[PDB]
Amino acid sequence: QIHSRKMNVSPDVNYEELARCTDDFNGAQCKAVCVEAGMIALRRGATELTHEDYMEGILEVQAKKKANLQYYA
Amino acid sequence: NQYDNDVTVWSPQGRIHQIEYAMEAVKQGSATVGLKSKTHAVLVALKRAQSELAAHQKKILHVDNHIGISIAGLTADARLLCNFMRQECLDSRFVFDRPLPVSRLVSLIGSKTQIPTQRYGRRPYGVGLLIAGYDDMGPHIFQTCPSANYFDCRAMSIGARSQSARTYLERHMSEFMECNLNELVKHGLRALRETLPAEQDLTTKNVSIGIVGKDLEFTIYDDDDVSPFLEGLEERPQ
Amino acid sequence: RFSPYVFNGGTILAIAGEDFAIVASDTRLSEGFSIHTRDSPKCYKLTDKTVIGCSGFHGDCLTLTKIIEARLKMYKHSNNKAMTTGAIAAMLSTILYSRRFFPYYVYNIIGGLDEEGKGAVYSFDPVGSYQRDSFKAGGSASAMLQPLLDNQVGFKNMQNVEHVPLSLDRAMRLVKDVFISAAERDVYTGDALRICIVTKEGIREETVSLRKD
Amino acid sequence: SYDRAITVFSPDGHLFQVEYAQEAVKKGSTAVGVRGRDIVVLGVEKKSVAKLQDERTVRKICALDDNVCMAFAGLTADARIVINRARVECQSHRLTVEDPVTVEYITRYIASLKQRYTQSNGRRPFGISALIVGFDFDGTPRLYQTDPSGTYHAWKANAIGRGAKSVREFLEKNYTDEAIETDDLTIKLVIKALLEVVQSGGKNIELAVMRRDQSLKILNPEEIEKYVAEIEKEKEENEKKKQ
Amino acid sequence: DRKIEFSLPDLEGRTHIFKIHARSMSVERDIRFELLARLCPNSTGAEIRSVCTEAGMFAIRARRKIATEKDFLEAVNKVIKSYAKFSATPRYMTYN
Amino acid sequence: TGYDLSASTFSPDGRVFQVEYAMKAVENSSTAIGIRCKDGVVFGVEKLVLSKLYEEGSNKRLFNVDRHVGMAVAGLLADARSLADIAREEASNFRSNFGYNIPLKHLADRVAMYVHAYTLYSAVRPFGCSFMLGSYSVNDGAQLYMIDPSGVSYGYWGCAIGKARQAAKTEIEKLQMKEMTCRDIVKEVAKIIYIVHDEVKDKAFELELSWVGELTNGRHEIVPKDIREEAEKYAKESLKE
Amino acid sequence: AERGYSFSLTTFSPSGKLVQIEYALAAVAGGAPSVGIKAANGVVLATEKKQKSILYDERSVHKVEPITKHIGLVYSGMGPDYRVLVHRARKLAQQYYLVYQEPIPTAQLVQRVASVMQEYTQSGGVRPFGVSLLICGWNEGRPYLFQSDPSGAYFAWKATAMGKNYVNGKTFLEKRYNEDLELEDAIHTAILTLKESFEGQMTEDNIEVGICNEAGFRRLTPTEVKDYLAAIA
Amino acid sequence: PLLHPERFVNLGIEPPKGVLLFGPPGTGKTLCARAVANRTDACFIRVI
Amino acid sequence: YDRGVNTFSPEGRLFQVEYAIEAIKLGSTAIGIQTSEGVCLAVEKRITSPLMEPSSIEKIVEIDAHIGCAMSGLIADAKTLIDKARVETQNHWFTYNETMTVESVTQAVSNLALQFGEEDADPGAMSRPFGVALLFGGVDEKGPQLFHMDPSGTFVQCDARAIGSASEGAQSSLQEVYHKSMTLKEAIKSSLIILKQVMEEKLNATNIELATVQPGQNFHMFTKEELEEVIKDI
Ligand SMILES: Nc1ncnc2c1ncn2[C@@H]1O[C@H](COP(=O)(O)OP(=O)(O)OP(=O)(O)O)[C@@H](O)[C@H]1O
Numbered sequence A: 001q002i003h004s005r006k007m008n009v010s011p012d013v014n015y016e017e018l019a020r021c022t023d024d025f026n027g028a029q030c031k032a033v034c035v036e037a038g039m040i041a042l043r044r045g046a047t048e049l050t051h052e053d054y055m056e057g058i059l060e061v062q063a064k065k066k067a068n069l070q071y072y073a
Numbered sequence B: 001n002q003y004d005n006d007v008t009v010w011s012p013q014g015r016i017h018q019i020e021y022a023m024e025a026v027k028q029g030s031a032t033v034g035l036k037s038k039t040h041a042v043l044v045a046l047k048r049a050q051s052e053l054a055a056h057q058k059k060i061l062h063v064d065n066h067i068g069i070s071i072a073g074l075t076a077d078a079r080l081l082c083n084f085m086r087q088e089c090l091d092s093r094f095v096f097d098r099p100l101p102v103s104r105l106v107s108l109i110g111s112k113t114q115i116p117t118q119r120y121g122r123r124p125y126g127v128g129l130l131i132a133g134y135d136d137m138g139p140h141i142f143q144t145c146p147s148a149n150y151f152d153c154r155a156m157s158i159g160a161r162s163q164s165a166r167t168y169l170e171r172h173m174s175e176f177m178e179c180n181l182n183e184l185v186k187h188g189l190r191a192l193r194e195t196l197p198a199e200q201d202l203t204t205k206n207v208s209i210g211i212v213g214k215d216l217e218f219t220i221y222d223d224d225d226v227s228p229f230l231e232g233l234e235e236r237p238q
Numbered sequence C: 001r002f003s004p005y006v007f008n009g010g011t012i013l014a015i016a017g018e019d020f021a022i023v024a025s026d027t028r029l030s031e032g033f034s035i036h037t038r039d040s041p042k043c044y045k046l047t048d049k050t051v052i053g054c055s056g057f058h059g060d061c062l063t064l065t066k067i068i069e070a071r072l073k074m075y076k077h078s079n080n081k082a083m084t085t086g087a088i089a090a091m092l093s094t095i096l097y098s099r100r101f102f103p104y105y106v107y108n109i110i111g112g113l114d115e116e117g118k119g120a121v122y123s124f125d126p127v128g129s130y131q132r133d134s135f136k137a138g139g140s141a142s143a144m145l146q147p148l149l150d151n152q153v154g155f156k157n158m159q160n161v162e163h164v165p166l167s168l169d170r171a172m173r174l175v176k177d178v179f180i181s182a183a184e185r186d187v188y189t190g191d192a193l194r195i196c197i198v199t200k201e202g203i204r205e206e207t208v209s210l211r212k213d
Numbered sequence D: 001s002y003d004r005a006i007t008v009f010s011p012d013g014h015l016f017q018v019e020y021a022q023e024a025v026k027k028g029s030t031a032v033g034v035r036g037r038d039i040v041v042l043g044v045e046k047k048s049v050a051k052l053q054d055e056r057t058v059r060k061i062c063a064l065d066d067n068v069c070m071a072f073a074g075l076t077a078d079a080r081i082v083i084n085r086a087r088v089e090c091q092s093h094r095l096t097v098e099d100p101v102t103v104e105y106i107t108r109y110i111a112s113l114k115q116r117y118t119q120s121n122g123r124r125p126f127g128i129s130a131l132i133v134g135f136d137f138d139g140t141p142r143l144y145q146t147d148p149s150g151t152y153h154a155w156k157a158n159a160i161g162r163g164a165k166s167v168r169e170f171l172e173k174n175y176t177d178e179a180i181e182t183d184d185l186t187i188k189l190v191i192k193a194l195l196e197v198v199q200s201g202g203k204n205i206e207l208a209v210m211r212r213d214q215s216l217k218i219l220n221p222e223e224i225e226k227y228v229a230e231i232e233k234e235k236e237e238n239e240k241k242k243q
Numbered sequence E: 001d002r003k004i005e006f007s008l009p010d011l012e013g014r015t016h017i018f019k020i021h022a023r024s025m026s027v028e029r030d031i032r033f034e035l036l037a038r039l040c041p042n043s044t045g046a047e048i049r050s051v052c053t054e055a056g057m058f059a060i061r062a063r064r065k066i067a068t069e070k071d072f073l074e075a076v077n078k079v080i081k082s083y084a085k086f087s088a089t090p091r092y093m094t095y096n
Numbered sequence F: 001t002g003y004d005l006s007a008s009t010f011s012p013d014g015r016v017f018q019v020e021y022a023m024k025a026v027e028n029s030s031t032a033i034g035i036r037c038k039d040g041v042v043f044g045v046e047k048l049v050l051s052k053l054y055e056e057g058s059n060k061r062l063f064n065v066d067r068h069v070g071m072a073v074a075g076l077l078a079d080a081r082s083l084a085d086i087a088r089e090e091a092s093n094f095r096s097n098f099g100y101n102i103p104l105k106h107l108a109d110r111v112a113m114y115v116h117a118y119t120l121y122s123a124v125r126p127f128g129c130s131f132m133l134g135s136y137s138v139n140d141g142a143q144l145y146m147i148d149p150s151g152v153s154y155g156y157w158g159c160a161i162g163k164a165r166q167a168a169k170t171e172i173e174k175l176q177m178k179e180m181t182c183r184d185i186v187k188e189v190a191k192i193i194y195i196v197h198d199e200v201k202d203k204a205f206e207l208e209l210s211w212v213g214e215l216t217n218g219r220h221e222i223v224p225k226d227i228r229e230e231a232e233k234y235a236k237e238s239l240k241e
Numbered sequence G: 001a002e003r004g005y006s007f008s009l010t011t012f013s014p015s016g017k018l019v020q021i022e023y024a025l026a027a028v029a030g031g032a033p034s035v036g037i038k039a040a041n042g043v044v045l046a047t048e049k050k051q052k053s054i055l056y057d058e059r060s061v062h063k064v065e066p067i068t069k070h071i072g073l074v075y076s077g078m079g080p081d082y083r084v085l086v087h088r089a090r091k092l093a094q095q096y097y098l099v100y101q102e103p104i105p106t107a108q109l110v111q112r113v114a115s116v117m118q119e120y121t122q123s124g125g126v127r128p129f130g131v132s133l134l135i136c137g138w139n140e141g142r143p144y145l146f147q148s149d150p151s152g153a154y155f156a157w158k159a160t161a162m163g164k165n166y167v168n169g170k171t172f173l174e175k176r177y178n179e180d181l182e183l184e185d186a187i188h189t190a191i192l193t194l195k196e197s198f199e200g201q202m203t204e205d206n207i208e209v210g211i212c213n214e215a216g217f218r219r220l221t222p223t224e225v226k227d228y229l230a231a232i233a
Numbered sequence H: 001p002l003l004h005p006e007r008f009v010n011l012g013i014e015p016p017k018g019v020l021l022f023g024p025p026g027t028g029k030t031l032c033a034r035a036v037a038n039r040t041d042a043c044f045i046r047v048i
Numbered sequence I: 001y002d003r004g005v006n007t008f009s010p011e012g013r014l015f016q017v018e019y020a021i022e023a024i025k026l027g028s029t030a031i032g033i034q035t036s037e038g039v040c041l042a043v044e045k046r047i048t049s050p051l052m053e054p055s056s057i058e059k060i061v062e063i064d065a066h067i068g069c070a071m072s073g074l075i076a077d078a079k080t081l082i083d084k085a086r087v088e089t090q091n092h093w094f095t096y097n098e099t100m101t102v103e104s105v106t107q108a109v110s111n112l113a114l115q116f117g118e119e120d121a122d123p124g125a126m127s128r129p130f131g132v133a134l135l136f137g138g139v140d141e142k143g144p145q146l147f148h149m150d151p152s153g154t155f156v157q158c159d160a161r162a163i164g165s166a167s168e169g170a171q172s173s174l175q176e177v178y179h180k181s182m183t184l185k186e187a188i189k190s191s192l193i194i195l196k197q198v199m200e201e202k203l204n205a206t207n208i209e210l211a212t213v214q215p216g217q218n219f220h221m222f223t224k225e226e227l228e229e230v231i232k233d234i
């Protein structure tokens, strides 16, 4: 919520949830999330951050290899 | 990076990596919700298909006539822990002539998944359970982890993008105690509909519902037994 | 010194109609010369269209019921259906044979509807062999009852008679008679009588009263 | 004891132990095998003799059974452990089934003994390849070839071990039905194939034939020198098609 | 801030990369580049550069002026099977 | 370097590092305090609620190891439930062969000695779990022991375990306790918990309490609901003031 | 608890050496000097006793043990590994004596004790033993002196040294050993060749001597050694 | 961000600085950088 | 650099099992199409010489007279599975006396899929996962069904699957040519068209195996004669 203020975010966003979504994150990674959300809103072609952008930023700034066999649920 | 190759090593920070990881096997699995009332417990699971020509893998596994589970993780491990529970509930019929009460069943899974997180070169079971049972204490839900902990819940969700459900369930946790049976399943679906992408919806070919109640031995619904619950369902607008 | 069996009497009987399966047994559980209890059916419903009748040493009836009633569930989880009568009969044979060197002491009469929708009855010995029959009695009065079914249901040693199938009405009143006639001459038959009719609509149970002597 | 996992999957999707055992075959000796209609000839190149060794203990063509013989190329040590278990199997089968082993069946058991060793704890793979050769209960000829993996195919002709890629290139063009029409033409096909990968003439090729319902004869060195004279005689009467 | 993984290409990629390197050399009419990609397992982009070189080589070694369908299957055999004996990708792939 | 990959490796310093780390996994758990008085023992766990989704008062950290022996744990909870079964199993083999409730001095030395066997080999991992055994008898009084990962047991008059181990040991040193009836202690325990807890590092908490002493006739229960409320009211008042 | 390792720790190196045995022989060469001298009617086993204060009680341990009525040991190297081999030897001797009713010959006992030490260079999860045993014995009319090495080998000697400065002592013995000695020097000459490697003053409680004649092996009482230490006997 | 710095400041964000390329040898970590090296048309300073 | 056989990737799934999947992409191609008329299994032999007998290659094996199978991957590792399948189906016939549902057999084979374990087992357990994917096609009381079973133990029913070194390519051409209303003669002809593109050599009567399993028949492998007749039509 401290690095969002610089930009336009919808009232949709729910910081309570995102915080619980991330884990083991540093101040440096939380910072990076907002950076990445804004970067996903730049590609999509909008000017607001929705709750969905932050969700895909977390997936991005979170270290995660390209595991395309994750279909054994 | 050397503290990740066994369950046997602790990390300087005071964790164990191999147990942390195993739990990422659960977040790869397919969303699933579980909530209760005071007369019914319900397991609503979002099945998944890995192709266009292919059926969907079963998320809800029948255990006994008052216990269901919903897996999420390696399926080969989920049927290794399901055969052990089926075997624990046939041990109780056969010795005590009663149903094994769920609280004492989840305590055996707890004793058997603890073991291989402390022996060399064995791994944790890469599967998380939701255990919906009903005995002489009303309904229960139990979430099991690969760490070997477990919890008594009033309404839990695991799998992928489960966090989106957990919030929906945490705003409505007050309303659940007063629902009739059909009203409850509506909640579960509306919670499970928040775990999808925004582009698709719940159909009859990728939803699985499991109901256990006071007078109703645990059943499972698929395909066209699920239609009496999607029909009537609210529309989810963006 | 120690004798691991005792003979607890009990008489079991079963007729396979053409869309119905009777399985009927007295309830007197007796040991030696005392009468332990007067009610204790020898009939356990297994599926929705399968009754089994155990009679003999009552310590083994209880075990052999819980074993079948378990390997019945176990089967259902792996195959996602219930077992047919035709299968239980085969399975029970193996179980029995598993203990070929300290055997069960249980005479088993399975009766239910196989797949087509017809009466089927299977008769076991103690060590586990079975054929399919149209009626078998077993147990203590097995030698009282077997000739009155060979005659009424089998028409054996008769001539110039009809052979119109067995009516659900002529069966039950047939059973009720042969048991009233075995309670006169056999000392292990009496008190009550569970008749289990097994149609395609479930399983009814009818209770009739025999002589308590 | 010593419960370790020797063979695990690569990340590339191989098994490096069963691929390394493939090299212990390539450092072996050439052996070929052609099947006729009444005769099957497998020859192993190099007796390995140094004018001091006996030719009775360096043999690489053993006989599992009476209608079944086997040549190998790899680690002589391992091969003797397989051959033994094979000979046991060949008698265990005469006890329980009256007929003698067929040649498929004693192979499927040599292969299945080698596959289990690349998927059990403690063990390295068997580092041998094999030509199992024989006649069935119907006089039919058969030629099977195994390898460390524990797979097996039949062949019409085949070579294993060192220099086997070259010898397979010679048998593609020369194995027809203008050859192997007689017992004399089938032995000459094998020798003519090992002469391409032996650098010391014919006095270095041990060669064993099996003939229909009779037992394995190893051709003494005199008969092989006679056949090598007919080969070299035939490359000077190909000078009637160059003139 | 952003970590980009360069995993080994898949089937679809390979097919693409053969076109990027072979289009420049003379090839007979009908080369199944999609079959040279089924025929590659998990290959580096730089393994496929090498294949195309050798398909060119056999054409040069034999004095023909055009690489054929055979020349690839042969040069794809040489460069992958043999040389894969001592590849980086197997071992170096866990540190990745 | 390579002195932490095994429990079977002393370091040059002189100390097994794998046991050190285990003990630090305890320090990152919520706090549990024990305090023995002259006619009973009272237990206190600072159980955090991490969501509103977990059912209330469930998945406890207060086991019954025997019909007169509490066990309050801290640290990695999975390994705790494992010990609580090894202990039940010992305190059954002891009633079997010797025919009388096992004495807590011995049940402790036997559960420590079992934890210790797990710091010797490389084939196993030392338990991440410190825990207190309380007990009351009329032939031995109250006794309170505390075990840890090392495999050490020590008699105590009070102690604490977990992330506020330091702040809570103060509150008990500033407390007379060899003179108070059981009934008066429970008020103290609640008050101590409330002090040592941070709601600026955690959300909220549920206060778990256990008798075992003269009140209950040598059994071990959980404090009845009414007395638990009274101890929470008297604890908010000492934070107001 | 555990299972145990299964894989040998003694392994060949590119040289063709078993590095572990090479090292365990260097432990042997740190140990207290020991000499052995076959006489012509007895064997003498003398050894530099260990101590490093006046607090130790120099009669509570013994570096010269009896294995049988007709056998003896001293050792050079690690003291714990010596109590293990002395104890597997005494049992070997008792199985042999239980089957043949006859005291185990000394050639036999060394050949078996050696095969125990050979088992620990090819067993799972162990290190070789850290000692060299010098086994005397007097059977069948003769005396015998052997020496087994942590390798497992064993060599009959007519006189030898082990432990610290065992290259200086094998030379010193090479000259001073002329067969047909009486039993009483081997003692004298033995004690001398301990002195060629010992710094300080020898006393009756500072070395240990054991003889081994037809009458049977026996440790020499402290009094007895004090007399041979007239440096003239 | 170097060709069109106007669209990142109008939204009100700040694009990210560094980028780590990693992969098995010979998968275009350098190639993909030889690429950006010329097309970028902005000062390019590579250290080995 | 070495780890266990049972290590989780920090990503989230088992190192070995993720690897054993790659061993499939080296194997031949198999295509199974499920119809109302029956199941067909088509798998290319992939002979490597002209000297090999194109007949001692078996990549379709009978499990019982109503449950076919097709292997792709390391055909050596299938030998252990196939034989457990048979002895499974027979034991189920020796006790319950009746055929076995196709699904149940594939479940009983998949319980071995995760069973390696360097230690804490027998001196006889597997050390490494199986390197092989299967296509059990059979006909029982649910009519025809076709299951796909990979080295992860995850089996699932398919209407039409392709595996092997043309899983990607063929799977996409099945989605365009499959539909509920087929007969068995349409499918056998449909698959061999897909199987003719993804092979490397020309499609002979010696380069495939066909099998079918139909309600009114047994498992029935097509011989070299009958194959000539359906390649004539293409
Ligand atoms: N995706 C690709 N497209 C086209 N060519 C590629 C690709 N990947 C690799 N190559 C080829 O591989 C060659 C070398 O690749 P490059 O050197 O960039 O790999 P790298 O990641 O830098 O490896 P290294 O770690 O050895 O430096 C290039 O010249 C190029 O032809």
Ligand SMILES: [Mg+2]
Pocket (backbone or CB within 6 Å): H029, H030
């Ligand atoms: Mg580079």
